[PDB]
């Protein structure tokens, strides 16, 4: 019914914050991402995660990092959290020097690959675009891929928004909600609240009319087998 969240440690929360990109990529600097990196670090510290921030990593430094982390002994840890703050497209997030397949990163944490996390919740929080679609608004054995939750900031195929000053709509909401509810609600329920917050309260403002008055809806993908609570 509920994941055992009473191991000696809550676990690791790895935050990959990519702000500056190689000129060859044509990717604009991600202003506001620093507010996100900070808010996440304080939010998950209060939840008792051992937080590690990494800034501006190349596509190969992200993979080597995920690989070393998956080789860590996660025995005394209840869970694993990974937040990726960057530019992206459906199925890929950008390293500082180029695109990285999302399937390449998550695969190190598979049930059969990271044995000290088998049966434990593996959370991937992703702030990145998933395409260029615009929302205008209206009105015994266990599967190797079991126990994964992907909290995507947007719907498959759509743009994801960020405020150069306040940070991304999604990370702002995720953190607000967790500060308020992590001691009362089940994770999926907290996440549903994030969906309501970003969908109702945020609307893009832009001088470029094609990017003005746009809406966003995050997207929870759960392969979890039990309810998750950050309290005991």
């Amino acid at each position: 019914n509920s994941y055992k969240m009473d191991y000696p440690e809550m676990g690791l929360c790895i935050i990959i914050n990519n702000k500056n990109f190689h000129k060859s990529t044509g990717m604009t600097s991600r202003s506001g991402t620093d507010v996100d990196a900070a808010n996440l670090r304080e939010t998950f510290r209060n939840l008792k995660y051992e937080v590690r921030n990494k800034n501006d990593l190349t596509r190969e430094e992200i993979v080597e990092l995920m690989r070393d982390v998956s080789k860590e002994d996660h025995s005394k840890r209840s869970s694993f959290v990974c937040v990726l703050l960057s530019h992206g497209e459906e199925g890929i997030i950008f390293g500082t020097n180029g695109p990285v397949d999302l399937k390449k990163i998550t695969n190190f944490f598979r049930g059969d690959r990271c044995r000290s996390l088998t049966g434990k919740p593996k959370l991937f929080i992703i702030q990145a675009c998933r395409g260029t679609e615009l929302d205008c608004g209206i009105e015994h054995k266990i599967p190797v891929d079991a126990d994964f939750l992907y909290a995507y900031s947007t719907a498959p195929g759509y743009y994801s928004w960020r405020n150069s000053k306040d940070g991304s709509w999604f990370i702002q909401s995720l953190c607000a909600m967790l500060k308020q509810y992590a001691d009362k609600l089940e994770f999926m329920h907290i996440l549903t609240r994030v969906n309501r917050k970003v969908a109702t309260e945020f609307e893009s403002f832009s001088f470029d009319a094609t990017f003005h008055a746009k809406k966003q809806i995050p997207c929870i993908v759960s392969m979890l087998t039990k309810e998750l609570y950050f309290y005991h």
């Binding site: 960020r162 403002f205 990017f211």
Partner: peptide
């Protein structure tokens, strides 16, 4: 607001 900018897009990621």
């Amino acid at each position: 607001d900018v897009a990621d």
